[PDB]
Each structure stands twice: as structure tokens, then as C-alpha cells.
Design an enzyme around this catalytic site. Structure first.
Site, PDB file in Angstrom:
ATOM      1  N   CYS A  51       0.812  -1.171  -0.011  1.00  0.00           N
ATOM      2  CA  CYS A  51      -0.042  -0.019  -0.079  1.00  0.00           C
ATOM      3  C   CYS A  51       0.948   1.255   0.123  1.00  0.00           C
ATOM      4  N   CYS A  56      -1.742   1.811  -2.743  1.00  0.00           N
ATOM      5  CA  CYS A  56      -2.662   2.851  -2.394  1.00  0.00           C
ATOM      6  C   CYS A  56      -2.253   4.276  -2.671  1.00  0.00           C
ATOM      7  N   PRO A  58       0.746   6.140  -3.637  1.00  0.00           N
ATOM      8  CA  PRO A  58       1.346   6.338  -4.997  1.00  0.00           C
ATOM      9  C   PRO A  58       0.140   6.488  -6.047  1.00  0.00           C
ATOM     10  N   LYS A  59      -0.569   5.693  -6.109  1.00  0.00           N
ATOM     11  CA  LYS A  59      -1.750   5.545  -7.254  1.00  0.00           C
ATOM     12  C   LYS A  59      -2.747   6.803  -7.028  1.00  0.00           C
ATOM     13  N   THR A 153       2.201 -11.850   4.735  1.00  0.00           N
ATOM     14  CA  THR A 153       3.422 -11.717   3.442  1.00  0.00           C
ATOM     15  C   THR A 153       2.554 -11.222   2.351  1.00  0.00           C
ATOM     16  N   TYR A 192      -8.775  -3.674 -11.254  1.00  0.00           N
ATOM     17  CA  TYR A 192      -8.956  -2.440 -10.978  1.00  0.00           C
ATOM     18  C   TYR A 192      -7.771  -1.711 -10.985  1.00  0.00           C
ATOM     19  N   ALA A 194      -5.352  -2.166 -13.290  1.00  0.00           N
ATOM     20  CA  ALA A 194      -5.186  -1.837 -14.755  1.00  0.00           C
ATOM     21  C   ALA A 194      -6.074  -0.765 -15.136  1.00  0.00           C
ATOM     22  N   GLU A 196      -7.022   1.830 -13.095  1.00  0.00           N
ATOM     23  CA  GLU A 196      -6.536   3.248 -12.529  1.00  0.00           C
ATOM     24  C   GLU A 196      -5.159   3.665 -13.032  1.00  0.00           C
ATOM     25  N   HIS A 464     -27.389  20.832   0.062  1.00  0.00           N
ATOM     26  CA  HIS A 464     -27.417  21.145  -1.251  1.00  0.00           C
ATOM     27  C   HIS A 464     -26.436  22.482  -1.465  1.00  0.00           C
ATOM     28  N   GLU A 469     -26.355  14.299  -2.642  1.00  0.00           N
ATOM     29  CA  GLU A 469     -27.739  14.598  -2.479  1.00  0.00           C
ATOM     30  C   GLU A 469     -28.515  13.673  -3.355  1.00  0.00           C
TER      31      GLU A 469
HETATM   32  C1  LIG Z   1      -1.529  -0.504  -7.586  1.00  0.00           C
HETATM   33  C2  LIG Z   1      -2.261  -1.198  -6.204  1.00  0.00           C
HETATM   34  C3  LIG Z   1      -3.249  -0.094  -6.010  1.00  0.00           C
HETATM   35  C4  LIG Z   1      -3.954  -0.658  -4.675  1.00  0.00           C
HETATM   36  N1  LIG Z   1      -4.873   0.389  -4.285  1.00  0.00           N
HETATM   37  C5  LIG Z   1      -5.503  -0.121  -3.141  1.00  0.00           C
HETATM   38  C6  LIG Z   1      -6.623   0.765  -2.852  1.00  0.00           C
HETATM   39  O1  LIG Z   1      -6.665   2.133  -3.241  1.00  0.00           O
HETATM   40  N2  LIG Z   1      -7.385   0.492  -1.756  1.00  0.00           N
HETATM   41  C7  LIG Z   1      -7.105  -0.572  -1.042  1.00  0.00           C
HETATM   42  O2  LIG Z   1      -7.830  -0.804   0.265  1.00  0.00           O
HETATM   43  N3  LIG Z   1      -6.069  -1.546  -1.463  1.00  0.00           N
HETATM   44  C8  LIG Z   1      -5.322  -1.347  -2.604  1.00  0.00           C
HETATM   45  N4  LIG Z   1      -4.786  -2.133  -3.073  1.00  0.00           N
HETATM   46  C9  LIG Z   1      -4.514  -3.404  -2.499  1.00  0.00           C
HETATM   47  C10 LIG Z   1      -3.297  -3.462  -1.447  1.00  0.00           C
HETATM   48  O3  LIG Z   1      -2.234  -3.185  -1.598  1.00  0.00           O
HETATM   49  C11 LIG Z   1      -3.092  -4.798  -0.555  1.00  0.00           C
HETATM   50  O4  LIG Z   1      -4.480  -5.387  -0.496  1.00  0.00           O
HETATM   51  C12 LIG Z   1      -2.537  -4.716   0.782  1.00  0.00           C
HETATM   52  O5  LIG Z   1      -1.259  -3.985   0.700  1.00  0.00           O
HETATM   53  C13 LIG Z   1      -2.454  -6.137   1.539  1.00  0.00           C
HETATM   54  O6  LIG Z   1      -1.579  -5.940   2.518  1.00  0.00           O
HETATM   55  P1  LIG Z   1      -0.673  -7.027   2.993  1.00  0.00           P
HETATM   56  O7  LIG Z   1       0.287  -6.259   4.309  1.00  0.00           O
HETATM   57  O8  LIG Z   1      -1.367  -8.346   3.320  1.00  0.00           O
HETATM   58  O9  LIG Z   1       0.441  -6.947   1.951  1.00  0.00           O
HETATM   59  P2  LIG Z   1       1.590  -6.399   1.842  1.00  0.00           P
HETATM   60  O10 LIG Z   1       1.405  -4.974   2.197  1.00  0.00           O
HETATM   61  O11 LIG Z   1       2.424  -6.600   0.638  1.00  0.00           O
HETATM   62  O12 LIG Z   1       2.853  -7.088   2.970  1.00  0.00           O
HETATM   63  C14 LIG Z   1       3.751  -8.002   2.494  1.00  0.00           C
HETATM   64  C15 LIG Z   1       4.834  -7.089   2.968  1.00  0.00           C
HETATM   65  O13 LIG Z   1       5.774  -8.411   3.573  1.00  0.00           O
HETATM   66  C16 LIG Z   1       7.143  -8.664   2.516  1.00  0.00           C
HETATM   67  N5  LIG Z   1       7.395 -10.046   2.426  1.00  0.00           N
HETATM   68  C17 LIG Z   1       7.067 -10.873   1.673  1.00  0.00           C
HETATM   69  N6  LIG Z   1       7.592 -11.709   1.462  1.00  0.00           N
HETATM   70  C18 LIG Z   1       8.099 -11.976   3.010  1.00  0.00           C
HETATM   71  C19 LIG Z   1       8.871 -12.657   3.525  1.00  0.00           C
HETATM   72  N7  LIG Z   1       8.940 -14.139   3.214  1.00  0.00           N
HETATM   73  N8  LIG Z   1       9.385 -12.500   4.746  1.00  0.00           N
HETATM   74  C20 LIG Z   1       9.263 -11.315   5.229  1.00  0.00           C
HETATM   75  N9  LIG Z   1       8.941 -10.153   4.656  1.00  0.00           N
HETATM   76  C21 LIG Z   1       8.123 -10.727   3.566  1.00  0.00           C
HETATM   77  C22 LIG Z   1       6.716  -7.858   1.165  1.00  0.00           C
HETATM   78  O14 LIG Z   1       7.909  -7.463   0.424  1.00  0.00           O
HETATM   79  C23 LIG Z   1       5.794  -6.710   1.752  1.00  0.00           C
HETATM   80  O15 LIG Z   1       6.572  -5.645   2.237  1.00  0.00           O
HETATM   81  C24 LIG Z   1      -3.831  -1.828  -4.048  1.00  0.00           C
HETATM   82  C25 LIG Z   1      -2.767  -2.730  -4.551  1.00  0.00           C
HETATM   83  C26 LIG Z   1      -1.948  -2.335  -5.971  1.00  0.00           C
HETATM   84  C27 LIG Z   1      -1.064  -3.322  -6.259  1.00  0.00           C
HETATM   85  C1  LIG Z   2     -25.799  33.492   0.154  1.00  0.00           C
HETATM   86  C2  LIG Z   2     -26.597  32.534   0.373  1.00  0.00           C
HETATM   87  C3  LIG Z   2     -26.210  31.093   0.565  1.00  0.00           C
HETATM   88  C4  LIG Z   2     -27.091  30.171   0.753  1.00  0.00           C
HETATM   89  N1  LIG Z   2     -26.452  28.696   0.689  1.00  0.00           N
HETATM   90  C5  LIG Z   2     -27.260  27.984   1.009  1.00  0.00           C
HETATM   91  C6  LIG Z   2     -26.557  26.427   0.930  1.00  0.00           C
HETATM   92  O1  LIG Z   2     -25.512  26.361   0.398  1.00  0.00           O
HETATM   93  N2  LIG Z   2     -27.536  25.510   1.533  1.00  0.00           N
HETATM   94  C7  LIG Z   2     -28.720  25.756   1.951  1.00  0.00           C
HETATM   95  O2  LIG Z   2     -29.235  24.619   2.278  1.00  0.00           O
HETATM   96  N3  LIG Z   2     -29.141  27.022   2.039  1.00  0.00           N
HETATM   97  C8  LIG Z   2     -28.513  27.887   1.744  1.00  0.00           C
HETATM   98  N4  LIG Z   2     -29.244  29.470   1.835  1.00  0.00           N
HETATM   99  C9  LIG Z   2     -30.420  29.220   2.104  1.00  0.00           C
HETATM  100  C10 LIG Z   2     -31.421  29.439   1.148  1.00  0.00           C
HETATM  101  O3  LIG Z   2     -31.312  30.364   0.099  1.00  0.00           O
HETATM  102  C11 LIG Z   2     -32.793  29.525   1.655  1.00  0.00           C
HETATM  103  O4  LIG Z   2     -32.961  28.917   2.823  1.00  0.00           O
HETATM  104  C12 LIG Z   2     -34.130  29.118   0.750  1.00  0.00           C
HETATM  105  O5  LIG Z   2     -33.852  29.597  -0.540  1.00  0.00           O
HETATM  106  C13 LIG Z   2     -35.334  29.115   1.287  1.00  0.00           C
HETATM  107  O6  LIG Z   2     -36.170  28.926   0.269  1.00  0.00           O
HETATM  108  P1  LIG Z   2     -37.581  29.592   0.095  1.00  0.00           P
HETATM  109  O7  LIG Z   2     -38.416  29.170  -1.183  1.00  0.00           O
HETATM  110  O8  LIG Z   2     -38.455  29.534   1.386  1.00  0.00           O
HETATM  111  O9  LIG Z   2     -37.153  31.111  -0.162  1.00  0.00           O
HETATM  112  P2  LIG Z   2     -37.114  31.418  -1.439  1.00  0.00           P
HETATM  113  O10 LIG Z   2     -36.178  30.835  -2.314  1.00  0.00           O
HETATM  114  O11 LIG Z   2     -36.373  33.129  -1.223  1.00  0.00           O
HETATM  115  O12 LIG Z   2     -38.531  31.924  -2.055  1.00  0.00           O
HETATM  116  C14 LIG Z   2     -39.098  33.136  -2.275  1.00  0.00           C
HETATM  117  C15 LIG Z   2     -39.486  33.571  -3.552  1.00  0.00           C
HETATM  118  O13 LIG Z   2     -40.779  34.321  -3.640  1.00  0.00           O
HETATM  119  C16 LIG Z   2     -40.439  35.711  -4.071  1.00  0.00           C
HETATM  120  N5  LIG Z   2     -41.437  36.206  -3.329  1.00  0.00           N
HETATM  121  C17 LIG Z   2     -41.369  37.254  -2.141  1.00  0.00           C
HETATM  122  N6  LIG Z   2     -42.227  37.888  -1.944  1.00  0.00           N
HETATM  123  C18 LIG Z   2     -43.234  37.455  -2.716  1.00  0.00           C
HETATM  124  C19 LIG Z   2     -44.608  38.001  -2.682  1.00  0.00           C
HETATM  125  N7  LIG Z   2     -45.143  38.659  -1.875  1.00  0.00           N
HETATM  126  N8  LIG Z   2     -45.443  37.321  -3.903  1.00  0.00           N
HETATM  127  C20 LIG Z   2     -44.685  36.472  -4.556  1.00  0.00           C
HETATM  128  N9  LIG Z   2     -43.600  36.135  -4.634  1.00  0.00           N
HETATM  129  C21 LIG Z   2     -42.984  36.725  -3.580  1.00  0.00           C
HETATM  130  C22 LIG Z   2     -38.993  36.025  -3.870  1.00  0.00           C
HETATM  131  O14 LIG Z   2     -38.523  36.910  -4.870  1.00  0.00           O
HETATM  132  C23 LIG Z   2     -38.426  34.458  -4.128  1.00  0.00           C
HETATM  133  O15 LIG Z   2     -38.278  34.559  -5.526  1.00  0.00           O
HETATM  134  C24 LIG Z   2     -28.264  30.452   1.235  1.00  0.00           C
HETATM  135  C25 LIG Z   2     -28.712  31.512   1.255  1.00  0.00           C
HETATM  136  C26 LIG Z   2     -27.989  32.754   0.828  1.00  0.00           C
HETATM  137  C27 LIG Z   2     -28.526  34.076   1.118  1.00  0.00           C
END
Ligand SMILES: Cc1cc2nc3c(=O)[nH]c(=O)nc-3n(C[C@H](O)[C@H](O)[C@H](O)COP(=O)(O)OP(=O)(O)OC[C@H]3O[C@@H](n4cnc5c(N)ncnc54)[C@H](O)[C@@H]3O)c2cc1C
Ligand SMILES: Cc1cc2nc3c(=O)[nH]c(=O)nc-3n(C[C@H](O)[C@H](O)[C@H](O)COP(=O)(O)OP(=O)(O)OC[C@H]3O[C@@H](n4cnc5c(N)ncnc54)[C@H](O)[C@@H]3O)c2cc1C
Ligand SMILES: [Au+]
Ligand SMILES: [Au+]
Lengths: 485, 485
Positions: A51, A56, A58-59, A153, A192, A194, A196, A464, A469
């Protein structure tokens, strides 16, 4: 009686180091043997295992480099004045990644010294009951004894039995430390790893071709797999379907050189040739359980696959030897599984706990150009388990806000949940294809452990505007056949 | 008897439009009145309401612009050859954002025409039981009658009662369509909108100063609020604590001009002056429930705050008038809450459902430079509710992988969960401060609806390497006092 150490961990990978640190937390004498047999080319790396050094981490970093490429492209529409086309420097990226990997190696070594864990850079080998033989790099041998043994191993890349593979092709082992730009590249396989590597090699601007045997991403949901294939293909990656290489021959040496690959069809005798700068083999991984002398202690293994069967307590047929990691039979080969199993095993052995490692519904993420996060059953597996008539598949396309201004890639992201009607429409499956897939997937995996139901999910209030979501308002079923555009 | 429409929705905001579409789904005659009274400066916008036009959407887009700025900075270390300093063009960013907003306005109008929903760009006003008066832009009046009414009137920015505010200051209403670069800017207030706008104005390279009255982010967890303040301050934003403006006077007109703001201390008579190019007022929002003639129909409102009390079925004291959105008393002022309440209200009125809107444990995200995602109780509120001795706070710093190569911002991200020991260590509170906060938070909110427990959360297997995985292995308590560095 006499016992040098209380626990000997063979292998310093994720799981091994986790178990070592935890067992050391309880004042037990622990020793870790880690030794990386060099790649056919000669690449070697430090402590930390697959790994950290070649997996894991360097990949993910190179995937981040690709994502920043796409961000550079996107930034133009948002008002940043960036030159139309920006070039990528392979050497600098490698330097940065390798520097961080070195820092992690050093961190682990320091951690082990701090917890009073003896680290010996030696290749482990069983010679007899409770005894092991350790050979250093130079060739010197030492003997050790222990009350308990932890086989951690791990695995090593598999090669095609074709001529030229070992001296001319590279594996995942070599790529992340390759000292030169790979140029045009041929990635063989559809695991996988290959996809990646293909994806992020394409993102940095190289010409990549993926050569697949039968299907993409065996084991993963085939519908999502096909979607990932389609998306990768529309990004400029080329796919050659139903082909396996039969020979690789060097046209010209260099950095990179030029190679010819001749490959045969799977269903005919049709033979095609191609020229590539390097060929990367990503066709699976083989357990390193053959050459550790398991016969001298009597550990039973599955000869066909090399995996070691274990109890739900990670215990082998020999009471005092436990195995964790990928080498296990019919478990999940992911780093957090290994780490969790190691931690729980140490706590069970030395902290009186009884909590076991749960291998059910563990999430995964494939970091293709379009991230793919999954948790639970595939559609196919779910239909197999519960019956087509009992499975409802809610799905929807969605359009992440961040992509609207770049005006790209609409109706591509895809989110689907698979629900069991017989069980209160329980959410047995979760699949998301879209940006930051793993971050969205972690939470829904934790929810699946809580038995999330379709009703509660519908009652959850989305945030949102966030991609995730889309999982709040899934209402269209595949069974209904309605459009989702 | 006679009734022009079955449902009249006053206000075409998120909630109003959602309810209109859903009630139309069941063949009911529905009419929507939407009219945006212009800003003091004169800014007006189309259909869709606050979220779409002046709120959620453009704020997220400009936050994305800031994030892409930081990505441009990051890309250098990953090997991309980008010039050291890149300048930002306000006009282009505004053009792109406003174009997308126009597209959403058009989308909503088309959707309403397709579902057979009459849209009338007129200001609504109650004149008598089941009757309303609609005044168009030009001044023409029309009368309408209905069986049921939905007040979805939303809120408008509040102004300080100081001289010069209305003609010289801008609000959230104006910023996202400002036709010129704001230059140096003074943001008054500490509501989440204030910090969002300050943050992304700082990210695009402007000089921003935030002037706060007492505390940051009232209503949100104060520890996280303080952390966000610290992080924003370390990014170059300047904070003036305990000050409120007393006068704004124009030094020179222009685009932007120059203004002087004179402000007084909160705890003394100390008076300070500053010169800014524009002053943005973000000090809260006021309900537009005063001027819709609620007296002519007898709807009781809270005169002090302007909010309308409602039943758990969104029903006012007058049976046939319902209110949704922010105008409600003691509810949550977020767009998904409004949309969900509208959908469920329509289904209750015309689809025989009985499912109510759940306003408990609804997540939120503040899109500061460092995203802040929250779900459930604050620490303070939790201690109030269950008792200090019964609350355990697990927390940890973590370091997102993507930042290690840029080598920036370590031990800043922060994740903490608040657990109730009296109730199986139930997770009553969730707070995450780190990249892609909302994506991580959606899932854990869905888990909280399922009653996630600390034990199950610990048993969930993380994904590696993903930021969210920090929530798998929380083991350090604040009560223990141990370090988390
Ligand atoms: C390119 C690649 C990408 C991967 N990406 C992921 C990922 O994103 N997520 C994930 O969960 N898994 C990933 N894996 C899988 C992961 O690498 C292995 O499942 C994990 O390392 C298994 O752990 P291990 O300790 O059993 O094996 P190892 O970590 O290889 O342990 C064996 C170690 O013991 C040494 N050894 C060998 N023979 C002997 C001996 N006779 N005496 C003493 N020491 C010895 C070996 O040289 C090595 O150092 C990836 C594998 C590869 C090849
Ligand atoms: C900068 C900013 C960032 C935000 N980011 C997030 C976020 O990341 N995540 C999140 O969950 N919430 C976020 N919010 C909150 C979100 O904008 C509000 O909680 C949400 O829009 C409420 O929905 P609403 O329909 O009740 O209000 P509104 O969407 O404002 O509905 C009111 C609408 O009715 C109109 N209206 C007003 N008065 C009248 C009337 N008398 N007659 C007819 N139409 C009318 C208004 O002009 C408007 O068009 C953010 C708010 C701001 C200001
Ligand atoms: Au290259
Ligand atoms: Au500017």
C-alpha cells in the site's frame, strides 16, 4: 519455555505493522521481519509494504495529478487566465511521489523504534515448530523462536507465461518509480489496478491502450464496469477486446525503448501486432506463500490458489500461527481490512477482547478517471441471492454542479441503490459513479452497517448543492423502465 | 363552490416550485406567483428564487473558482508547468455563473409549462378569505381565488439602520451579479454567508476584511467556528473583532468607487475608520411576511421575528393556508428542508400520504475556504441536553493525502463525533472540518437517521486512502486530555 519473542510478524505491510504496533501497546515482545524481493528489473523499496510504497498511496497521488490536469482544463471557464495547453513533467511528479513515500517509510521505522518493536530487514522462512530462519540482504542467516507467528506476507504481481515479459515489461511494482516517461503504453489486464493506471496515465497526456481478455473489472458490478469502460473510451483511451499477448520483443533499447507485442484472439486465430514504448502487466497478483517453508510447520494452504484458509479468528489449522492480509482465502484484499484484522487480532490475543473482524459489506473505490465507489452486493449477486422478483433497483443520472460551467460530461455520473423488498426494502447494495466517490461511499457504508432502509434514506435530508444528495431522492426503478435522462 | 385554482403558491422559490410540481403531478389546478422586488441598487433576477439565483448555486460556483485557484497553486508540485502567479478575471467568472443561472431559470420555466402549472410574474397579496390580489411589473392588478394557499415567501437581506447602507453597500443579492471587480472589500457580519463570501473573495486574490460583532457563526458549534476563524485568518483574511459600522460615506464614485466606513466598539467608545472599495452587508435575513396582507385572512404570525408558527403538518392557524420554507418559526432554513417539506405537503394534501417532514438532525455545510460539515447537536447543545458527565467527545486531526505533496496545511483538518454514553454511546453529533466536507457528511447524516452507534462505527471498515476514513478509527477523547497531534 524459552522464546525469543512473543510474536513474530513475517511481513511489514499494512496489516503486519498494525498488528505489531498494537501488540507492542500491551507490553509484549514483538519482532517484524520485512524484506522486499526485488522486481525482475531490480526495483526495491523500503518498509511499509505494498500500500505505502507501490500501491494505495502513489496511485492516489498520480490520480490526483490527473485530476489536477482536468482542473487546469476546467479553470479556464471559471475566469482563470491559463494557457490553452499545459505540458506535464513525469520526472518531477515521480520525484515528489517518491519523496513522500520515503517520508512514510521513515515514519514507520521511527514508529516501530518508538514502540520498542525490533525491525529486522531479513527474509523470513519457517524451518521448524516455533522457529524461523532470517536471511539478510548480504546473505547472513540467523534463527529466531516465538510463541506466536503472524503470516502477513502479501502478494506480488503475476506475469504472463510468455517470452519477454520479465525483462521487457513492467508491473505496478515498477511504474510508480519509473525513472523515465513511459510514452505510449500498453496496459494488459482489466483488474482495478489496470484501469486505475490506464486512466491516470491517460490524464497526464500519454497515449494509452488497454488490452482486455474477456470482461472489465471481474468481481465488480458489471453494469458499472461497462459504464466505466464507456467513459474511459470516450476520454481517448483505446480498448482492444478479447486479446492476450503471446510475445513481447524489443525493437530498440532506450528510456523508453521501443517494443513489439504480438497477441492472439481469444475466440479465433486472428493475430495482431502493435508497437509500444512500454508494456505494463496488470493481470492479477499471486500469494507469496510458496517459499516461506509452511511445510516445515504443517500449515495447510490451498495449493491451487496459494491462499491460506483461516478461522473467523484469523487462525490457521496450526493453533499458534495466524495469517492476515490478502493471503487469506475468500476474504477481501483491501488495506483497511488488513489493518482492522491486525488490530482486532492483537486485541484478541493480548487484550481479552472478543470483537471479530467483519468482512461483510466492506466498501471499495476504483479510482478510474471517473471514480467508482461501491458497498455491498452487486446487482447480479443480489439477484442470485434474493431472487429477481424481490430486488428493486433505484437509479438515476445526476450532473455535479462543478461541471456545468466547464460544460462537460453531462448525464454520465450514475447512482444506483439495490433494495431488498422482502426485508423492508433494505438497502443491500450501493454504487456511485461520480466525483469524490469514496467520500460519498464511506458514509453509506457506515449506514449499511446500521441496516439503512429505503424509507429512512428517503427521509434523510440532502445537503445542497452536493453530488451526494442524489442519494436522497432516488425514485425511478429499472423495473418501471422509465427514462432517467 | 367557485375556485379558480386548487392551490396557489405565493413565491417561486425552491419549496414553492417543488410543491407546485408535485401537486401538478396529481392533476390538480395550481398557480405560482413569483415576483422579486428589486434590490435598493436595482438588481433583479428570474424565476427560481434565492437558492438558484442568488444563493446555494452561485455561492458554490464561486467557491469552486476559489478551490481551482488553490488547485492551480497545488499543481506545481505535482509536475505541471504552470506560471508562478496567475491572475483572476472577475468579469468572466460573473459571465459564466450568470449564464448558468439563466439556464436554470429557463429550465424551471419550461418545467412549469410542461406540468401544466400557470406561472404569473406578479406580486401576491391577500385581500380576503380565499382571495388574493396580483400586481404585475407594469402595475396592472388581477384577482384570484383558491381552495388552498401555500406561503413560500422566503426572506430578504437585512440592513443596518445606519446612514449610507442602502445606496452605498451591497448585499448577497448584488454580489453574484456585480458588473465590476469589488477590489478591497469589507464584509460585515458573521453568518455563514458572511464567511462563505469572505473566503471565496479572498481565494480569488482580493483583499477582504471581516468585521464581526461578537462571535462567529452563531448557532453552529463554537469550537469548530473558532477553528474556521483561525484558518481563515491564517489565509490572509483580516478580522476586526467587536465592531459594528455606524456610518458609510462615499469618498469617490466609480466601479468600484471608494467608501469610508466609521465604526464604534461594542464595549467602549473607541471609534475606528477604514477605506474600502465596497462594503457587503451579511448580517442576517428578514422574513417577507409583513407586506402580503396576512391580516386580511387572519394568519397569526410572530410579530417580533416575522416568522409564522405552523403545525407539524406545515398548517397555519387558518386551516386552508399552509406555509413552508424559511418563514417558518423554529425550523431549519435550508433548501433541501424547504424542498422536502413542499414535496411531503403536496403528497399529504393530494396523495393520501401520512409521512411528515423530519426537521431533526438535518445536516449543513458552510463552504468556507476549509469546508465545514455538520450534522446533529453541537457540543454545547449536547452537554446542555444530556449532561457533561454523559457526553464523550472523540476527536482527531487528520492530514488529507492530496495536501502532502503541496506540503501545506497539516494538522488543520479536524473531525469530531459527540457520543451519548447513557444510550449505548449513540452518535448524537457529527462535525468534520476538511476537504469535501458535505460529501462525507451526507452519509453520516443518513447513518444518524439509522441510530448509528459508536460500536458499529468502529466496526465499519474505512476506505483507503480517503479523508473520510478518519471517522473509522476515532479513539482519543477530549476527556482523556491526550494529545492528538
Ligand atoms: C497498484 C495497487 C493499488 C492498490 N490500491 C488499493 C486501494 O486503493 N485500496 C485498497 O484497499 N487496496 C489497494 N490495493 C491493495 C493493497 O495493496 C493490498 O491489499 C494490501 O497491501 C495487502 O496488505 P498486506 O500487508 O497483506 O500485503 P503487503 O502490504 O504487501 O505486505 C507484505 C510485505 O511483506 C514482505 N514480504 C514478502 N514475503 C516476505 C517474507 N518471506 N518475509 C518477510 N517479509 C516478506 C513484502 O515485501 C511486503 O513488504 C492496491 C494494490 C495495488 C497493487
Ligand atoms: C448567499 C446564500 C447562500 C446560501 N447557501 C445555502 C446552502 O448552501 N445551502 C442551503 O441549504 N441553503 C442555503 N441558503 C439558504 C437558502 O437560500 C434559503 O434557505 C432557501 O432559498 C429558502 O427557500 P424559500 O423558497 O423559502 O425562499 P425563496 O427561495 O427566497 O423563495 C421566495 C421567492 O418568492 C418571491 N417572493 C417574495 N415575496 C413575494 C410575494 N409577496 N409574492 C410572490 N413572490 C414573492 C421571492 O422573490 C423569491 O423568488 C443560502 C442563502 C444565501 C442568501
Ligand atoms: Au510524459
Ligand atoms: Au479582482
Amino acid at each position: 519455555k524459552s522464546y525469543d519473542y512473543d510474536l513474530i510478524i513475517i511481513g511489514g505491510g499494512s496489516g503486519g505493522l498494525a498488528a505489531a504496533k498494537e501488540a507492542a501497546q500491551y507490553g509484549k515482545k514483538v519482532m517484524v521481519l520485512d524484506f522486499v524481493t526485488p522486481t525482475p528489473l531490480g526495483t526495491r523499496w523500503g518498509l511499509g509494504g505494498t500500500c505505502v510504497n507501490v500501491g494505495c498511496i502513489p496511485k492516489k497521488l498520480m490520480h490526483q495529478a490527473a485530476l489536477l490536469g482536468q482542473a487546469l482544463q476546467d479553470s479556464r471557464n471559471y475566469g482563470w487566465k491559463v494557457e490553452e495547453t499545459v505540458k506535464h513533467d513525469w520526472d518531477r511528479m515521480i520525484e515528489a511521489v517518491q519523496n513522500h513515500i520515503g517520508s512514510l517509510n521513515w515514519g514507520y521505522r521511527v514508529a516501530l523504534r518508538e514502540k520498542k518493536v525490533v525491525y529486522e530487514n531479513a527474509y523470513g522462512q519457517f524451518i521448524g515448530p516455533h522457529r524461523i530462519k532470517a536471511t539478510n540482504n548480504k546473505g547472513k542467516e540467523k534463527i529466531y523462536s516465538a510463541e506466536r507467528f503472524l503470516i502477513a506476507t502479501g502478494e506480488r504481481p503475476r506475469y504472463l507465461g510468455i517470452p519477454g515479459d520479465k525483462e521487457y515489461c513492467i508491473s505496478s511494482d515498477d511504474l510508480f518509480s519509473l525513472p523515465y516517461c513511459p510514452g505510449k503504453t500498453l496496459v494488459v489486464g482489466a483488474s482495478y489496478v489496470a484501469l486505475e493506471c490506464a486512466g491516470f496515465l491517460a490524464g497526464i497526456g500519454l497515449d494509452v491502450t488497454v488490452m482486455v481478455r474477456s470482461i472489465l473489472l471481474r468481481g465488480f458490478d458489471q453494469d458499472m464496469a461497462n459504464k466505466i469502460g464507456e467513459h474511459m473510451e470516450e476520454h481517448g483511451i483505446k480498448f482492444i477486446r478479447q486479446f492476450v499477448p503471446i510475445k513481447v520483443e524489443q525493437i530498440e533499447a532506450g528510456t523508453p525503448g521501443r517494443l513489439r507485442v504480438v497477441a492472439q484472439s481469444t475466440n479465433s486465430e486472428e493475430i495482431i501486432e502493435g508497437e509500444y514504448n512500454t508494456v505494463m502487466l496488470a493481470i492479477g497478483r499471486d500469494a507469496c506463500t510458496r517459499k516461506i517453508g509452511l511445510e516445515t510447520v504443517g500449515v495447510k494452504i490451498n495449493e491451487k490458489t496459494g491462499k491460506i484458509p483461516v478461522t473467523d479468528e484469523e487462525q490457521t489449522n496450526v493453533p499458534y500461527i495466524y495469517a492476515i492480509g490478502d493471503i487469506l482465502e475468500d476474504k477481501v484484499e483491501l488495506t483497511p481490512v488488513a489493518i482492522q484484522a491486525g488490530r482486532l487480532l492483537a486485541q484478541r490475543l493480548y487484550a481479552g477482547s472478543t470483537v471479530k473482524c467483519d468482512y461483510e459489506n466492506v466498501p471499495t473505490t476504483v479510482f478510474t478517471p471517473l471514480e467508482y465507489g461501491a458497498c455491498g452486493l452487486s446487482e447480479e449477486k443480489a439477484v442470485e441471492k434474493f431472487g429477481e422478483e424481490n430486488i428493486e433497483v433505484y437509479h438515476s443520472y445526476f450532473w455535479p454542479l462543478e461541471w456545468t460551467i466547464p460544460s462537460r460530461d453531462n448525464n454520465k455520473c450514475y447512482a444506483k441503490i439495490i433494495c431488498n423488498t422482502k426485508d423492508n426494502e433494505r438497502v443491500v447494495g450501493f454504487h456511485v459513479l461520480g466525483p469524490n466517490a469514496g467520500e460519498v461511499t464511506q458514509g453509506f457504508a457506515a449506514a449499511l452497517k446500521c441496516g439503512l432502509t429505503k424509507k429512512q434514506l428517503d427521509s434523510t435530508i440532502g445537503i445542497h448543492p452536493v453530488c451526494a444528495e442524489v442519494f436522497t431522492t432516488l425514485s425511478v426503478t429499472k423495473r418501471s423502465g422509465a427514462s432517467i435522462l
